[PDB]
């Protein structure tokens, strides 16, 4: 009630810098092709190849670009490819953004700083997506009580379980105002080592 | 509960129709039948029973009484509702808070039970009240299954002066009534099933006493008194000085630890010193 | 893992007149990019009745009729079949006669139709679907009218009649009289030759084993192939069709249970599985064109070296795999005769050498390669086995391991728990390549030509290496 | 905010009691209350008349939109109109709450007012997950709430309000 | 019959008053409105069904919880009538995309005492009962048309919105099209379908009045029924007890139950932490292998090993697709002495999935169906095992045919008949956990060999004469098996690069002796090491260290793991030779 942790920037221009949701985000690996030779570093993956296809986090991947993709070039994964855009758009109400994930919204913004031909098409699969999970997570999380939620949950990311955290966190307060129990002053945080 | 379930547990209606002799247990039948209520009806819990048989069931069966003997049936008491399906008679708040207070099995210390039965008075617990309902019940159907015991054995002494009982740790749910509170219950209700069960006219007019172990370890029992039977009694017990006196004289080792006189703690070895002396002053 | 498409989604890089006039909007398609335009010419050049359909595209064209034709199937299906041919003979009106009827089959990504025979409930019904599993029978294929042709010898006249059943996208019951005497006056004469007939089958999809959730007998449904569609399924399969959902009812004496059948109207059918790879680029022709000129000395010892990787040791036996894995070349004579090209490979050893492995790979490698053991095979269920119909209880011929594995592999490990009356069922189709059966009411000789590959361990448990090689 | 301090601001509307025992004027820092003559009305602040209720010292009275007729024909224009209607009072829930648990006796027909409370909201709260609703499907900028009260606001803010940031972001992030 | 929609109309009027007005909870605390919240919370999520209680429904108006139970066929469509126009009054104006209201299946439980399907006496037809029982069978979902539309077929003429009446009775279809005689079709677009099921209920089994065979009795779910219980469950089930109307003796009908009410009889945050704990305390290993086995004491070695059974490595798939084994095999050699059937029973009982087998058979069969005079095939226990675990005793006793097939199915992990029709494949993923009392090769299919041995000193007979009351006289495994559910599904362990020159330096020396070993000796028969044990240490350890939810294995329990194997092998040397 009172530990605020920083929130997460992902959406943004830029993440936030100690937000332990974004540090774990841009770990995610991302598929690079080197430019140049990678000289007495070769050990990873002595010296490497130019056009060489490899996988390197998205942080990492950060200063190592340019404008003019003077050490490597960027391609993006399938999910974010032609192929899923299309799916997201028969019903997205279907598909588990837990295993295409689990930070979906998260790095689908931050592909967005290597300046590639189809990020107008990229930030409007995003919006359309979000848009069409709406009513499906205004709906089971305002309306799902005292149940067993762990199965509408099974198939959201992190930035849709934060709202489903916050549906039932205003439901299961007015129902606990309704029936006069929201008067009786309790243990806050000790509850919790209980 | 049902409406066979409660006859054959009210130490009013197990008394006079001896339901603990498969002889009589047959009046029970013949008095369900007087009435033409189905026997598969009668097993079934009240408030599912058809709605075209409780109509004037307070009336048909406060008759079907006086055709075997039964002619104080109605009592006067009175009844509560909070809402739509909340309605209590006011004595079953009372067997539901008197068995909150004394569940056997013990969570803490003496005042633990306490807490929870001054808990379940006020109307925003009914989930404790509608709990404390059934051990009420598991009691009520573990005392039925004792007073059949010491009358289908003949453990009921006849002393003397006064009857007397006991109590044996092999028997099931005996551990129950080892509080020293839920103990004159189980005495006075087998009083009032001796009474008329016994073909006798002088046990019929005479206290019992009672005992029951208490402790393994100190090695010690319980003990109550409770005064002669009848419909009209008093009501003035007189054990609180016979069992002070009796101590006494014998000089042995007794604890008037409560409130009330005529409950007692006794040493296992001292039982027959103490019962001797008591029963030669008695007399 | 969830198919929410068709076309593998990860890497595939490597009244009733609005209905009618937006779906030949849509089929015009000459001024974005001509998709479509390009597609009914190439089906006329191949004589085809059926276009099979994206509606991605329809979406992106126009949702509302997306949305109205994934929720109406039979209203505007029969609007999108009348304005194709009205699209047709825009291109070609003598063709667009020679066909009765086209059609139009569906393929894309269905929003929540992706559904399996278990969850395919009642919520369902009149609704296009794509239903995925394992096909586990058929039927006979059998003709059905779809319209007569009468003729009056006395009146000179020519009379017609158009059929239609439950299984249409209509659905009037219609009565198989086949007039006789239209007037009471002048008789009738069917005429054959100029009727109308079709096509028609009925398959029985069936829930994947690997996703039931085990504790039940998983669940079924009916599909009804036809006009084409017809033999694209056999039993043993994984397909994915997308038809339309119907009820079909019925009465025994006027009076009905409420109880109906509901069957699944194909009008398309997908192999799951890749089982072939003739698809090589101009680039991999190139590359392998220079591979096989680069060096003649070593490319048989660097082809068999880079075999089975994931094995130590080995080498002369990868180098005789390879050999099977080629092949000889089968020499017919000009009498008749014929002399076999395969070659058969036997591997004996102590336990624990890889055996079991090599088998699986070569599996895996080869197109066509069957499984078996030494326990689980009897001599007959290797090649041929009489048995008979639940239907029609005439005998026929079922086909064993060997005659499946035509022109492929058969992989037997064990090969030495196998009695002495079960190999002799071998030596014909191992050599002379064709199975002869003369049961009781049979006389059949089947085409087996193929290869073995058999693992066997020694007698002694190992191979005592003092014995000979014989014992 | 939480439903516990919404019901804190909607202890300041006045209400009349019947006080039975004699006090003589009061000086609050938010206004004067009394005389209280025994057996005569006067007009007091809610937390006081609950509080006074609970020790048997006065005597409520049902306020005079909380009538049983009235009531059945908000709750009808409330289903005829298409928009937000405005309401007897804004904190009508929490008074027909505090007033209905404590009170139930000196008010005649509280389990009709009840339910007719209970109606009126089950619709105010309909319409506002279809005015919240539009919002998102058409990616406004703005939308007027005509007549909501602080709690039907309350019940279903903080969950809109963070799931609109999330779109501000999503929708201008292509824009650098 | 004009008095009868006036009645109704006035029914129809009082069972929505109820659903309107009943609350609950006291004056001091507060109230809160128990049917209208739950309508709405149903509705908007997209469910339609209420669970109405019969005791509230009774103690609201007592006149119609009689009614409901003598006549609840033309009662229950009152009130699933009511529920549709209060859900209406509640939910309404709906958003966008739903306008059309939904119809809502009324349910209902109650709390009052079950008869049994002894006490169906006819008297008892067509009044609500509630029986207790177990699920037998269950059909498949099938449609069941509820408003059906005709038309004639000559002139042409249309008849539509008949509904069809509830249960299993069918309809009457005219024959007088106002044309030939019965002129009328159904129209198959315009009919609007719900699922049904149709159950099979068996009577408990200590109910049987113990000479026969118990009775079952036949239901009938519903739209929201259905899928809801699974043949091998408790219920508890209220139905309308009535009667087929399709229209031994002569007016005999038959029986069903129509289901109208169904229960069924039986992980946290706060919970993940006991498992935390103790998978981080010092001695984690040896508080499991002390509880798993209370009863039989004595060589904890046979009760250390099965400790891994239940954990189990991890299932890799290299780039291949050449998966490998998950799951790990166990063989007790030993007299059949009754000491191991007692462990049989315990690891079956504390197994998440776990079978204990002495009918048709372990694996597949194909045998001649009387119905079809065809071959049909015969999934036996280890493909319904999946991932579980399977028990077996008296290894010489199965089947010939079956231990062949037992051997091919612990050799590959999954079951291909080729027989005179049937051609399939069954995955088997399960545990063999075998007890003996023998091929060097289906010996050698496991990879633990434990026989049993014994002594006979006078302190050893002091050790007995404990022993001895230790059965006269005669960690919980109720959270040992959720706590093993989680523990499996979140470690995901490999080995670490020192494990490797571990077990590269033990296993080449393991070989290195067997050749002066087999080539001098050669007694016909022995066991030299192979890759396949190997593999299998490599999954004891794996097993092992996921008991830490350590996903790095170390040199902290390969070494004590070979030993353990140093017993089980040698087990099987004496037992060869
Ligand atoms: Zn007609």
Redesign the pocket.
């Known amino acids: 009630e009172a530990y605020f942790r920083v929130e997460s920037g992902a959406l943004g221009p830029e993440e936030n810098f100690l937000s332990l949701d974004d540090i774990l985000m841009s770990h995610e690996k991302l598929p690079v092709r080197t430019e140049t030779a990678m000289p007495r570093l070769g050990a990873f993956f002595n010296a490497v190849p130019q056009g060489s296809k490899l996988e390197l986090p998205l942080w990492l991947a950060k200063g190592l670009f340019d404008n003019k993709r003077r050490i490597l070039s960027v391609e993006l994964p399938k999910i974010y490819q032609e192929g899923w855009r299309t799916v997201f758009s028969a019903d997205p109400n279907v598909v588990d953004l837990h295993k295409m994930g689990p930070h979906f919204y998260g790095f689908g913004s931050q592909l967005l700083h290597f300046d590639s031909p189809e990020n107008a098409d990229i930030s409007q699969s995003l919006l359309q997506t979000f848009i069409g999970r709406f009513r499906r997570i205004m709906d089971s999380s305002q309306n799902a009580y005292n149940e067993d939620t762990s199965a509408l949950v099974a198939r959201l990311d992190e930035m849709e379980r934060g709202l489903f955290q916050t549906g039932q966190k205003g439901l299961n307060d007015f129902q606990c105002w309704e029936k006069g129990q929201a008067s009786q002053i309790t243990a806050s945080n000790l509850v919790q080592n209980y | 509960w049902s409406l066979h379930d409660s006859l054959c547990n009210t130490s009013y209606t197990a008394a006079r129709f001896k339901l603990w002799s498969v002889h009589g247990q047959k009046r029970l039948q013949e008095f369900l039948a007087d009435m033409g209520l189905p026997l598969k009806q009668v097993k079934q819990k009240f408030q599912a029973m058809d709605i075209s048989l409780k109509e004037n069931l307070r009336e048909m069966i406060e008759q079907s009484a006086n055709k075997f003997g039964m002619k104080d049936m109605r009592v006067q008491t009175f009844s509560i509702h909070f809402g739509f399906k909340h309605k209590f008679l006011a004595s079953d708040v009372v067997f539901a808070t008197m068995s909150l207070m004394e569940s056997p099995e013990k969570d803490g210390s003496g005042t633990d039970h306490f807490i929870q039965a001054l808990d379940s008075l006020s109307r925003s617990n009914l989930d404790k009240l509608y709990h404390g309902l059934e051990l009420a019940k598991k009691q009520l159907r573990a005392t039925q299954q004792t007073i059949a015991s010491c009358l289908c054995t003949n453990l009921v002494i006849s002393q003397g002066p006064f009857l007397y009982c006991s109590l044996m740790e092999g028997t099931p749910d005996v551990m129950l009534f080892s509080r020293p509170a839920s103990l004159s219950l189980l005495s006075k209700h087998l009083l009032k099933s001796f009474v008329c069960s016994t073909k006798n006219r002088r046990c019929k007019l005479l206290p019992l006493v009672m005992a029951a172990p208490l402790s393994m370890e100190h090695g010690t029992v319980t003990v109550v008194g409770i005064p002669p039977e009848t419909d009209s009694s008093d009501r003035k017990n007189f054990f609180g000085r016979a069992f002070e006196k009796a101590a006494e004289s014998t000089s042995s080792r007794m604890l008037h630890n409560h409130f009330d006189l005529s409950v007692i703690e006794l040493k296992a070895e001292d039982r027959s010193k103490f019962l001797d002396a008591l029963i030669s002053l008695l007399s | 893992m969830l198919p929410r498409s068709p076309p593998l989604p990860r890497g595939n890089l490597w009244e009733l007149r609005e209905a009618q006039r937006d779906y030949l909007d849509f089929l015009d398609d000459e001024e974005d990019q001509g998709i479509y335009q390009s597609k009914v010419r190439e089906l006329i050049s191949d004589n085809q009745y059926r276009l099979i359909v994206n509606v991605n595209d329809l979406r992106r064209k126009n949702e509302k009729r997306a949305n109205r034709l994934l929720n109406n199937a039979f209203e505007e299906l029969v609007a999108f079949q009348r304005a194709l041919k009205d699209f047709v003979a825009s291109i070609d009106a003598t063709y667009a006669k020679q066909y009765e009827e086209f059609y139009v089959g569906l393929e894309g990504s269905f929003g929540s139709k992706h559904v399996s025979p278990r969850t395919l409930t009642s919520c369902f019904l009149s609704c296009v679907v794509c239903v995925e599993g394992i096909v586990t029978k058929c039927s006979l294929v059998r003709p059905k009218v779809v319209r007569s042709v009468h003729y009056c010898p006395a009146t000179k006249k020519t009379i017609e009649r158009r059929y239609s059943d439950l299984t249409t996208l209509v659905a009037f019951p219609s009565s198989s009289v086949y007039p006789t005497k239209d007037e009471e006056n002048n008789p009738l004469e069917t005429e054959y030759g100029l009727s109308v007939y079709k096509d028609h089958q009925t398959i029985t999809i069936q829930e994947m084993p690997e996703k039931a959730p085990a504790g039940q007998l998983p669940r079924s449904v009916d599909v009804i192939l036809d006009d084409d569609l017809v033999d694209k399924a056999k039993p043993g399969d994984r397909v994915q069709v997308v038809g339309t959902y119907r009820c079909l009812p019925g009465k025994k004496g006027g009076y009905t249970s409420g109880t109906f059948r509901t069957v699944l109207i194909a009008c398309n059918v997908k192999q799951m599985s890749k089982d072939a790879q003739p698809s090589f680029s101009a680039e991999d022709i190139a590359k392998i064109k220079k591979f096989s000129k680069t060096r003649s000395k070593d490319i048989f010892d660097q082809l068999a070296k880079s075999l089975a990787p994931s094995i130590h040791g080995h080498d002369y036996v990868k180098k005789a795999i390879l050999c099977l894995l080629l092949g000889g070349v089968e020499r017919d004579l000009e009498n008749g005769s014929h002399i076999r090209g395969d070659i058969n490979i036997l591997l004996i050893g102590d336990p624990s050498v890889a055996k079991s492995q090599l088998l699986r790979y070569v599996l895996c490698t080869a197109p066509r390669a069957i499984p078996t053991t030494g326990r689980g095979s009897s001599g007959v269920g290797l090649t041929a086995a009489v048995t008979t119909d639940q239907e029609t209880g005439e005998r026929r011929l079922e086909a064993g391991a060997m005659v499946l594995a035509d022109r492929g592999v058969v992989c037997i490990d064990e090969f030495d728990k196998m009695s002495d009356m079960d190999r002799t069922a071998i030596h014909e189709v191992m050599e002379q390549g064709r199975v002869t059966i003369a049961k009781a009411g049979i006389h059949a000789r089947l085409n087996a030509r193929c290869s073995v590959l058999a693992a066997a361990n020694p007698v002694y448990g190992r191979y005592d290496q003092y014995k000979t090689p014989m014992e | 905010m939480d439903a516990a301090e919404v019901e804190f601001l909607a202890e300041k509307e006045l209400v009349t009691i019947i006080p039975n025992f004699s006090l003589d004027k009061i000086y609050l820092i938010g206004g004067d209350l009394g005389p209280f003559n025994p057996g005569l009305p006067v007009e007091v602040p809610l937390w006081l008349a609950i509080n006074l209720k609970q020790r048997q010292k006065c005597r409520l009275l049902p306020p005079e939109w909380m009538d049983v007729e009235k009531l059945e024909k908000m709750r009808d224009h409330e289903r005829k109109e298409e928009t937000f209607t405005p309401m007897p009072s804004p904190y009508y829930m929490e008074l027909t709450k505090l007033l209905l648990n404590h009170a139930s006796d000196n008010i005649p027909k509280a389990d009709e007012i009840r339910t007719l409370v209970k109606d009126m909201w089950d619709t105010r709260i309909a319409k506002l997950r279809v005015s919240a609703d539009s919002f998102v499907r058409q990616q406004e900028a703005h939308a007027k709430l005509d007549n909501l009260t602080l709690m039907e606001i309350n019940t279903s803010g903080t969950f809109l309000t963070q799931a609109l940031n999330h779109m501000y972001k999503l929708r201008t992030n292509l824009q650098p | 019959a004009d008095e009868g929609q006036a009645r109704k109309s006035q029914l129809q009027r009082r069972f929505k008053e109820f659903l309107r007005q009943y609350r609950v909870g006291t004056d001091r605390t507060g109230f809160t409105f128990k049917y209208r919240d739950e309508l709405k919370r149903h509705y908007n999520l997209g469910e339609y069904w209420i669970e109405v209680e019969m005791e509230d429904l009774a103690s609201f108006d007592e006149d119609l919880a009689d009614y409901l139970y003598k006549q609840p066929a033309e009662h229950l469509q009152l009130l699933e009538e009511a529920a549709k126009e209060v859900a209406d009054e509640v939910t309404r104006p709906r958003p966008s995309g739903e306008e059309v209201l939904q119809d809502i299946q009324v349910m209902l439980k109650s709390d009052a005492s079950p008869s049994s399907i002894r006490s169906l006496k006819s008297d008892m037809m067509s009044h609500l009962v509630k029986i207790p029982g177990i699920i037998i069978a269950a059909s498949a979902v099938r449609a069941k048309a509820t408003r059906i539309s005709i038309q ?6 249309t008849l539509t919105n008949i509904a069809m009446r509830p249960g299993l009775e069918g309809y009457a279809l005219p024959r007088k ?3 030939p005689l019965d ?2 079709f159904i129209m198959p677009d315009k009919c609007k379908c719900v699922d049904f099921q149709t159950l099979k209920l068996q009577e408990l089994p200590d109910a049987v009045p113990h000479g026969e065979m118990p009775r079952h009795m036949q239901l009938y779910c519903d739209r929201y029924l259905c899928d809801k219980v699974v043949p091998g469950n408790r219920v508890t089930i209220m139905g309308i007890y009535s009667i087929k109307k399709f229209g031994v003796g002569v007016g005999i009908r038959s029986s069903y139950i129509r289901v109208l009410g169904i229960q069924v009889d039986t992980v946290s945050p706060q919970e993940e932490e006991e498992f935390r704990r103790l998978a981080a305390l010092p001695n984690v290993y040896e508080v499991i292998s002390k509880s798993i086995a209370p009863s039989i004491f004595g060589g904890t070695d046979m009760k250390k090993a099965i400790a891994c059974l239940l954990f189990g490595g991890s299932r890799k798939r290299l780039p291949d697709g050449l998966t490998r084994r998950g799951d790990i095999n166990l063989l007790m050699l030993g007299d059949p002495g009754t000491a191991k059937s007692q462990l049989l029973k315990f690891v079956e009982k504390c197994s998440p999935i776990g079978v204990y087998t002495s009918a048709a058979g372990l694996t597949a069969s194909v045998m001649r169906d009387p119905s079809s005079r065809n071959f049909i095939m015969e999934g036996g226990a280890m493909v319904l095992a999946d991932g579980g675990v399977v028990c077996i005793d008296e290894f010489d006793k199965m089947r010939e045919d079956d231990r062949v097939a037992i051997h091919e199915a612990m050799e590959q992990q999954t079951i291909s008949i080729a027989k005179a029709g049937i051609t399939t494949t069954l995955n088997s993923r399960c545990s063999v956990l075998a007890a003996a009392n023998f091929m060097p090769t289906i010996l050698s299919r496991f990879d633990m060999i434990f026989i049993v041995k014994d002594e006979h000193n006078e302190e050893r007979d002091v050790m007995l004469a404990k022993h001895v009351i230790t059965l006269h006289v005669s960690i919980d495994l109720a959270k040992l098996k959720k706590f093993i559910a989680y523990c499996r599904v979140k470690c995901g362990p490999r080995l670490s690069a020192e494990a490797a020159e571990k077990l590269k330096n033990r296993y080449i020396i393991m070989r290195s002796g067997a050749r002066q070993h087999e080539r001098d000796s050669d007694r016909r028969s022995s066991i030299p090491i192979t890759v396949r044990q190997l593999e299998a240490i490599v999954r004891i350890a794996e097993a092992l260290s996921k008991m830490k939810l350590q996903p790095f294995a170390t040199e902290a329990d390969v070494e004590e793991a070979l030993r353990l194997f140093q017993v089980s092998t040698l087990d099987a040397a004496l037992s060869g030779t």
């Open positions: 004639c077929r000559s002139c042409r003429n099209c106002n044309c002129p009328y």
